Ligand binder design. Structure first.
Ligand SMILES: CN(C)[C@@H]1C(O)=C(C(N)=O)C(=O)[C@@]2(O)C(O)=C3C(=O)c4c(O)cccc4[C@@](C)(O)[C@H]3C[C@@H]12
Lengths: 206, 205
């Protein structure tokens, strides 16, 4: 409930993003995240025990902007879940293009963050999160089955992986070669292309 | 050879070992050299720097599929889409059965940072992806020229959609393998992809 410590936590997060982004997550110490932030070594430790905790705080911020539509899509009480899933994807893509903060954490996540046995928790955290995310899209896809928006004999599980794979590879393609996906201009196409596969692909049924 | 040609294959092997253990960012050539039992100078005779080693591991992934790739990319092929099916199935098989291929993909996706202290890695990957992208395009185009796919079909985007999907499937399997019976369901996983390209209006113009 104090405020200096809420200010200081929010500045460690900013510095970390800028640091991890220049030097990468591998060779960046917490001492480093200190000098850049203006703060003190001790303060980073009060706030974060280790760098894997910090990285986790970063990955976690990405789910905040989307919580609403995510929760709506998966509630069995939603009238239009495919509807919420389509708007979620439009928002994910839009936020990625407009918001430099999101583009950078994604860049840290995809191109600047090694899984080395020396730092085992980076990978575990990441596994957990993809399983989480996985959980969600499944409940959601199965809801669009009941309500007759997706084919009735769909395999939610596999369909979820298909879609996740598709969204993940596309975000990554765009971070590597933005000038090859007019992702802002065509966002509707890219999102719908993914959904297409889910509703029509015969190999996703059963 | 005189001074070994093989020394090369031995440096590449120690590079995979070091890279897989400590990652690309913090492996030095002295690490690689001690791992291979040679000196830094022996490394310098085959490679100018670390980005050259990474490059050579990356470029080693392409050999196996070589002929099925050219086959798809050739106009004179009777069955371009079937050649892409054969290729995807091999990509998935080799990845699941060959520890060497699994380890290098794992280096590439999860143990290789792009940082401006070396920008060559990011650049090498970029051209690598455009190269491959260009191949998919010409592949998708033939399948259209012979009515294996829908008509006048927007290739460029279906290409990107293809690569995105395969790429993210691989990465998904490297992260959580016991959640994609990749080996066992290879047929379904490949075709889900191919179904996208033929049955998706959004990929039509
Ligand atoms: C080791 N792994 C198996 C291969 C690889 O080294 C890749 C890489 N970027 O290093 C892939 O992206 C690789 O995983 C990959 O994504 C490949 C493809 O996407 C395709 C697609 O989609 C269609 C036709 C041909 C290919 C391909 C030959 O380029 C595939 C090569 C794949």
């Amino acid at each position: 409930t104090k405020e200096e410590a809420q200010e200081t936590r929010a500045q460690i997060i900013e510095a970390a993003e800028r640091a991890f982004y220049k030097r990468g997550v591998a060779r960046t110490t917490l001492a480093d995240i200190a000098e850049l932030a203006g703060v003190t070594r001790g303060a980073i430790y009060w706030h974060f025990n280790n760098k894997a905790e910090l990285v986790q705080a970063l990955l976690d911020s990405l789910h905040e902007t989307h919580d609403h539509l995510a929760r709506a899509s998966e509630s069995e009480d939603e009238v239009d879940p495919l509807g919420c899933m389509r708007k979620l994807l439009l928002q994910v893509f839009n936020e990625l293009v407009l918001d430099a903060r999101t583009r950078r954490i994604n860049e840290i996540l995809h191109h600047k963050c090694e899984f080395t046995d020396d730092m085992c928790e980076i990978r575990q955290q990441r596994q957990s999160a993809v399983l989480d995310c996985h959980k969600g899209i499944t409940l959601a896809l199965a809801n669009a089955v009941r309500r007759g928006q997706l084919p009735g004999e769909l395999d939610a599980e596999r369909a979820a992986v298909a879609m996740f794979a598709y969204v993940d590879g596309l975000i990554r393609r765009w971070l590597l070669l933005p000038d090859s996906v007019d992702l802002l201009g065509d966002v509707e196409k890219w999102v719908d292309t993914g959904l297409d596969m889910l509703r029509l692909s015969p190999a996703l049924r059963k």
